[PDB]
């Protein structure tokens, strides 16, 4: 007679991470509009015919 | 030196109420003409994010107790759904407190 059993195997799945996006707001915007254009407002026309 | 993120110079708020605290009879504390609660967000709590990263990975790779949650109506997949979602909180706390600096190479140097 061969005496019974004496054999198991481990309940084991290794852990890892997939498709974890680096979605931080650290560079979250790029858009700009200038603070108006350059103009002259200080001078008269002096249009005395 | 009590360090606030370079991108939040305004990061404070106040209320002031006219009603003082009070302490149940037989309680532990003094009587005080003034008192304060504070609610402050800081990256320092990320060490607990990372502590749940160590305690999940240690015991879940061993799938210990997983069958108790599963047997009551979850699946193993949603116990990973959660892990990974928490990872996106954890890696975010690993990046949010950085400075609003842009551009490449070092900050200063030499030339001929």
UniProtKB/Swiss-Prot annotation, chain A:
Provide the record's note on post-translational modification.
Answer: Phosphorylation at serine and threonine residues in S-P or T-P motifs by proline-directed protein kinases (PDPK1, CDK1, CDK5, GSK3, MAPK) (only 2-3 sites per protein in interphase, seven-fold increase in mitosis, and in the form associated with paired helical filaments (PHF-tau)), and at serine residues in K-X-G-S motifs by MAP/microtubule affinity-regulating kinase (MARK1, MARK2, MARK3 or MARK4), causing detachment from microtubules, and their disassembly. Phosphorylation decreases with age. Polyubiquitinated. Requires functional TRAF6 and may provoke SQSTM1-dependent degradation by the proteasome. PHF-tau can be modified by three different forms of polyubiquitination. 'Lys-48'-linked polyubiquitination is the major form, 'Lys-6'-linked and 'Lys-11'-linked polyubiquitination also occur.
Q: Where are the Tau/MAP repeats?
A: 8-38
Q: State which tissues express it.
A: Expressed in neurons. Isoform PNS-tau is expressed in the peripheral nervous system while the others are expressed in the central nervous system.
Swiss-Prot/TrEMBL site (Not glycated) positions:
13, 19, 23, 33, 42, 45
Give residue numbers for the modification (Phosphoserine): 7, 26
The entry's localization annotation reads: Cytoplasm, Cytosol; Cell membrane; Cytoplasm, Cytoskeleton; Cell projection, Axon
- Residue(s) carrying N6,N6-dimethyllysine: 13
- Cross-link Glycyl lysine isopeptide (Lys-Gly) (interchain with G-Cter in ubiquitin), residue numbers? 13, 19, 23, 33, 45, 49
Where do glycans attach?
A: 49
Q: What is the effect of changing residue 22 to F?
A: In PIDB; markedly reduced ability of tau to promote microtubule assembly
N6-acetyllysine PTM positions read 13, 19, 23, 33, 45, 49
Impact reported for residue 3 to S: In FTD1 and CBD; reduction in the ability to promote microtubule assembly
Q: Which disease is it linked to?
A: In Alzheimer disease, the neuronal cytoskeleton in the brain is progressively disrupted and replaced by tangles of paired helical filaments (PHF) and straight filaments, mainly composed of hyperphosphorylated forms of TAU (PHF-TAU or AD P-TAU). O-GlcNAcylation is greatly reduced in Alzheimer disease brain cerebral cortex leading to an increase in TAU/MAPT phosphorylations.
Function of this protein? Promotes microtubule assembly and stability, and might be involved in the establishment and maintenance of neuronal polarity. The C-terminus binds axonal microtubules while the N-terminus binds neural plasma membrane components, suggesting that tau functions as a linker protein between both. Axonal polarity is predetermined by TAU/MAPT localization (in the neuronal cell) in the domain of the cell body defined by the centrosome. The short isoforms allow plasticity of the cytoskeleton whereas the longer isoforms may preferentially play a role in its stabilization.
* Record's comment describing the protein's domains: The tau/MAP repeat binds to tubulin. Type I isoforms contain 3 repeats while type II isoforms contain 4 repeats.
Protein name (record): Microtubule-associated protein tau
Q: Which organism is it from?
A: Homo sapiens (Human)
Q: Which gene encodes it?
A: MAPT
Swiss-Prot record, chain B:
Q: Which residues carry this modification: 5-glutamyl polyglutamate?
A: 104, 106
| 3'-nitrotyrosine modification, residue list | 112
Positions of region (Disordered):
93-112
Q: How does it assemble?
A: Heterodimer of alpha- and beta-tubulin. A typical microtubule is a hollow water-filled tube with an outer diameter of 25 nm and an inner diameter of 15 nM. Alpha-beta heterodimers associate head-to-tail to form protofilaments running lengthwise along the microtubule wall with the beta-tubulin subunit facing the microtubule plus end conferring a structural polarity. Microtubules usually have 13 protofilaments but different protofilament numbers can be found in some organisms and specialized cells.
Q: Describe the function of this protein.
A: Tubulin is the major constituent of microtubules, protein filaments consisting of alpha- and beta-tubulin heterodimers. Microtubules grow by the addition of GTP-tubulin dimers to the microtubule end, where a stabilizing cap forms. Below the cap, tubulin dimers are in GDP-bound state, owing to GTPase activity of alpha-tubulin.
Say which residues of the entire protein are included here.
340 to 451 of 451
Locate the site labelled Involved in polymerization: 112
Cross-linked sites for Glycyl lysine isopeptide (Lys-Gly) (interchain with G-Cter in ubiquitin): 31
Protein name in the entry: Tubulin alpha-1B chain
Q: What is known of its domains?
A: The MREC motif mediates interaction with TTC5/STRAP and may be critical for tubulin autoregulation.
Coiled-coil annotation reads: none
Sites of Phosphoserine modification: 100
Instruction: Tell me its family.
Output: Belongs to the tubulin family.
Species this protein is from: Sus scrofa
Q: What does the UniProt entry say about where the protein is found?
A: Cytoplasm, Cytoskeleton
Q: How is it modified after translation?
A: Some glutamate residues at the C-terminus are polyglycylated, resulting in polyglycine chains on the gamma-carboxyl group. Glycylation is mainly limited to tubulin incorporated into axonemes (cilia and flagella) whereas glutamylation is prevalent in neuronal cells, centrioles, axonemes, and the mitotic spindle. Both modifications can coexist on the same protein on adjacent residues, and lowering polyglycylation levels increases polyglutamylation, and reciprocally. Cilia and flagella glycylation is required for their stability and maintenance. Flagella glycylation controls sperm motility.
């Amino acid at each position: 007679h061969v005496p019974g059993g004496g054999s198991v195997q481990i309940v084991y799945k290794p852990v890892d991470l997939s498709k974890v996006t680096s979605k931080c707001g650290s560079l979250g915007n790029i858009h700009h509009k200038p603070g108006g254009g350059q103009v002259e407002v200080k001078s008269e026309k002096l249009d005395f015919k | 030196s009590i360090q606030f993120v370079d991108w939040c110079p305004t990061g404070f708020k106040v209320g002031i109420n006219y009603q003082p605290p009070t302490v149940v009879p037989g309680g532990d504390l003094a009587k005080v003409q003034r008192a304060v609660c504070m609610l402050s967000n800081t990256t320092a709590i990320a060490e607990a994010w990372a502590r749940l990263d160590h305690k999940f990975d240690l015991m879940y790779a061993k799938r210990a107790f997983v069958h108790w949650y599963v047997g009551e109506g979850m699946e193993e997949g949603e116990f990973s759904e959660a892990r990974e979602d928490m990872a996106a909180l954890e890696k975010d706390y690993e990046e949010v407190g950085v400075d609003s600096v842009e551009g490449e190479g070092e900050e200063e140097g030499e030339e001929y």
